[PDB]
């Protein structure tokens, strides 16, 4: 059985000064509608949304950060503008905190449904996104790091050191996820992202291939950065073939979380890449060979409404067991993949 | 508009 969580209340988070800001309420309703149209919704077990608790947010975030975002629930517009402007790329409304709680709690219920055996896998149609949120700050349209929190929540109901793989295929580097787990060998973070030597958001060398983790976490952070090319299905398939899947098999995770942004999709106004819905289906199908199929797909970014609706629907089709649907790499993608292989061969025998 | 992620 495949689980699905979606709650229209997450649409209430909005940009009161710029109604055309790309992190649109209708991102999630358009994805949900397309699941209905393609007759995928009726094939899924509907998992209820819920609010994360503040205790659960403290799995990854400081009490100061939690209390600041919480206080925005009661702010007047001038103070919402001032607070949001203190962060890198954040807008806040009075509903933002609640929606961020619903996004996280929905993913907790999905992870719980998988780990109690109610469903084999699941998809979470949630906003605002999470992967740029840091322990102490909001960032990049994200308030709390939903995927990072879900990994810790999964560990909290099974084994403190349960091996969790987070694959972040949003076109942006998940700086927050990397940092939260950078010293941790129980959570393997693998990010593919446009990088452009730091010109692409989040504009930090933290996203480069030589950032491999720290302390006992050394080797458990895998950055696959793209430079100088409009990447697409061939490049993402090659990165999965040479890097993501061999490393993941060696790690042997018990749960796979996908930070599934769809802004590397053909048509995305921010990403500039051309991964197709069929491409995302093949990526999902490969991940389903891990963790006895225990895969939770969490919406992150993705800003072309048609693109994200078709792409995420294709992912759910794969989770449901449908057959996957039916080219040389850009030369700089070969360079990137080889750079990551050189960086990580000391840690993963499958790369030697 | 000086928003890092939108490049606007
Ligand atoms: K990413
Ligand atoms: K890690
Ligand atoms: Zn993104």
Residue numbers in the entry:
A (entry chain A): 443 to 768, 773 to 798
B (entry chain I): 1 to 8
Extract from the study:
However, we obtained a crystal structure of des4.3.1 with zebrafish (Danio rerio) HDAC6 at 1.7 Å resolution. This peptide inhibits human HDAC6 with an IC50 value of 17.1 nM, 88-fold more potently than HDAC2. The binding orientation of the peptide is similar to the design model, but the structure of the peptide is very different. In particular, d-Arg8 occupies the negative phi region of the Ramachandran map (φ = 166° in the design and -46° in the crystal structure). If the d-Arg is replaced by l-Arg during conformational sampling, the lowest energy structures are very close to the crystal structure. The newly adopted conformation is complementary in shape to the contour of the active site and stabilized by several backbone-backbone hydrogen bonds and n → π* interactions. The peptide also forms both direct and water-mediated hydrogen bonding interactions with residues in the outer active site cleft of HDAC6. Notably Ser531 of HDAC6 donates a hydrogen bond to the carboxylate group of Asp7 and accepts a hydrogen bond from the backbone amide of SHA; Ser531 similarly accepts a hydrogen bond from the backbone amide of bound acetyl-lysine HDAC substrates. Mutation of Asp7 to Ala did not result in a significant change in IC50 for HDAC6 or HDAC2, while mutation of D-Arg8 → D-Ser raised the IC50 10-fold, suggesting an essential role for this residue, possibly due to its complementarity to the negative electrostatic surface potential of HDAC6 in this region. HDAC6 was not the target in the computational design calculations, and it is unclear whether the binding mode of the peptide to HDAC2 would be similar or different from that observed in the HDAC6 structure.
To address this challenge, we develop a computational “anchor extension” methodology for targeting protein interfaces by extending a peptide chain around a non-canonical amino acid residue anchor. To test our approach using a well characterized model system, we design cyclic peptides that inhibit histone deacetylases 2 and 6 (HDAC2 and HDAC6) with enhanced potency compared to the original anchor (IC50 values of 9.1 and 4.4 nM for the best binders compared to 5.4 and 0.6 µM for the anchor, respectively). SHA can coordinate to the zinc ion in the active site of HDACs. In all the crystal structures we obtained, the thiol functional group of SHA coordinates the catalytic Zn2+ ion with a Zn2+– S separation of 2.3 Å in a distorted tetrahedral geometry reminiscent of that observed for the inhibitor Largazole.
